[PDB]
Design a protein around this ligand. Structure first.
Ligand code: 2YL
Ligand code: 2YL
Ligand code: ZN
Ligand code: ZN
Lengths: 365, 365
């Protein structure tokens, strides 16, 4: 099996659909990655995650290095064995969470409480976890930022990107079996995004993430930045938008050339009682669902919608029952995967523009 | 299919093993019933409950009448449809929980806050839920109690038992498709237990519960009372010990003629980090399991023990992850079902005495 082989099968405008072949499996793109923070996709067994259609999940380096610890997970046989997911795992670098969840920043890296993270240590931690797609250690520039502060931050991220590349390449077993993605920064500024893209391309990565855009800038601004940022990245490698997003965010980002996504929304909002449907999100705890015998979504193919009603799930979530969180989460992840499948098929079939319009019309109605 | 047919296939001492055939399925005895309080066996899909070997689950009349409500569940198609469990369900009468969870007691029944429960209303609620085994509405005498107070309480329960019988029999659809169990009371007093047994037998029930013994009297005292109480009940009907218990409680009660059990222990203690093993319970959060790659129990056949380590489950429970509760609960219910299976097979094979001794020796070691 290939270490990493990205093939584009079809295009429509800026949108692409295809596959990433890796040693632990094939990733169909555009892809959505369920987030598995503390070595679990919350409230789901791995077989259930797979049953929804997920090809790859995301693990969080920051969380796992603290609990249970990277060396410990390696001693226990790696993250795949540990959590019982045998397909690809992408690990974030810890660069974002080290700032949002903990700090002292310097050229060497970040020291923090509740430890030190550097490009080299991040790569080593991801090696110990046995990650399939390794993220370069970066800095998520706060939003908003002055052009000059965004520039100095992006430039540090680019130096860290080179250091991540070198650390990764130095570890033969990692270089042979895993892939490395670089992260574009530059805030909302076109010239900095270009400088960042050029720096990353000069180094060379297996894939390129658009970083710094899951920062509450709003969809309009996010799209504006994607409009010029994604074409700067190498066309022949995957484009990964970190931390995005709602279903309409995803459709628009794919329209702008994004191939990969991760977001806690389907899992987290699922536990909180929000279910995604083709007619938009619903709050299942709302009184209007108390005697509603329809499934969460009446076109959804997931196991939850085959078996249980809105009324039942309403009851569970209001009662604080774990099964409520389980069913909501499975449905939401399945919905996200069905969305990605519809996206992939429509691009392949050259009807993605129509799909996007049809989707938005119904979802917002 | 039979409404209710109890067959004893084999005996050893006071212990029996056999089957209860009902319209929604066969119940292998001795049986353990997972408790499904608010129309869910906590943290388990019904298919998972079934996969562990459970033939029947328990639903709680008190909880369900408040949330989502009995008439509502009936409107939604009954409890079986509502929660997606199509096999037998035994419903408790609400008689215990109305006192422990809420009161005004009278001959008519119990009025309470956070409503009124009577033998007739209890039976009607259980009818609306679509219960397969209906419990007579009773009074769980507090422990300890004077002989005279235990007597007046038991006598009220016996009058309520007759009223439950009459209400059940009046509802043709219920009488044709469900079964009715009476509940023996009398605290720890032999003469009152006898009076109670005689009263219940005079009325006639499909099964007989030993009530009033899940009250913190200790195992020695519980066994003492079972020693004389169970032989008072009709031999040819099932004997149900409500709210019991730990694995050794169950083995001893079967040695004393009990055929059916329910307990929240495997589910509740599972979520709290206690896993049952053949070498006794373990607290999975304990530091000694942090790098333990063995399954929860190395003889257990459950899906959890086929796939995940102690170390992983340790990590999940310490992290407050829902999957931790899911895996612990599935294992614990599976352990309980494997215990019942070993009990059934050993009685059938005429080696139950040896099994009980072997079990106790290892479990307490
Ligand atoms: N490492 C990194 N992570 C994220 C990020 C932000 C929000 C949700 C998820 C990831 N953004 C970045 O620019 N870098
Ligand atoms: N209805 C009833 N329930 C119980 C009971 C006690 C503890 C746990 C479960 C049931 N004991 C009784 O004597 N009657
Ligand atoms: Zn669904
Ligand atoms: Zn097990």
């Amino acid at each position: 099996r290939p270490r990493f082989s990205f093939s584009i099968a079809a295009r429509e405008g800026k949108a692409r659909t295809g596959t990433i072949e890796m040693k632990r499996g094939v990733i169909r793109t555009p892809a959505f990655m369920p987030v598995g923070t503390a070595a679990t996709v919350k409230a789901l067994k791995p077989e259930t995650v797979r049953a929804t259609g997920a090809d790859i999940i995301l693990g969080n380096t920051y969380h796992l290095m603290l609990r249970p610890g990277a060396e410990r997970i390696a001693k226990l046989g790696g993250l795949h064995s540990f959590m019982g997911w045998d397909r690809p795992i992408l690990t974030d670098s810890g660069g974002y969470q080290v700032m949002s969840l903990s700090t002292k920043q310097s050229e060497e890296g970040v020291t923090f409480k509740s430890h030190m993270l550097s490009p080299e240590r991040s790569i080593e931690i991801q090696h110990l976890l046995g990650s399939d797609i390794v993220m370069a250690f970066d800095e998520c520039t706060p939003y908003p930022a002055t052009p000059s502060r965004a520039a100095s931050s992006m430039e540090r991220s680019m130096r860290w990107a080179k250091r991540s590349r070198d650390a990764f390449d130095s570890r033969k077993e990692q270089a042979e079996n895993a892939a490395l993605f670089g992260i574009q920064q530059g805030s909302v500024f076109e010239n900095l995004r270009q400088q960042s893209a050029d720096a990353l391309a000069e180094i060379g990565f297996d894939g390129y993430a658009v970083g710094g855009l899951a920062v509450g800038e709003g969809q309009d601004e996010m799209f504006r930045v994607l409009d010029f940022s994604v074409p700067m990245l190498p066309d022949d490698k995957p484009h990964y938008l970190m931390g995005v997003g709602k279903p309409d965010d995803i459709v628009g980002a794919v329209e702008r050339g994004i191939d990969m996504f991760d977001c806690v929304l389907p899992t987290r909002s699922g536990r909180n009682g929000q279910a995604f449907t083709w007619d938009g999100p619903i709050n299942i705890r709302n009184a209007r669902f108390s005697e509603d015998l329809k499934p969460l979504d009446s076109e959804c193919h997931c196991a939850v919608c085959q078996k249980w009603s809105r009324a039942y799930i309403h009851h569970l979530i209001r009662a604080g029952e774990i099964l409520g969180a389980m069913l909501m989460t499975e449905h939401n992840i399945a919905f996200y995967q069905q969305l990605m499948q519809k996206i992939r098929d429509s691009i392949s079939e050259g009807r993605f523009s129509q799909f996007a319009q049809d989707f938005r019309a119904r979802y917002f109605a």
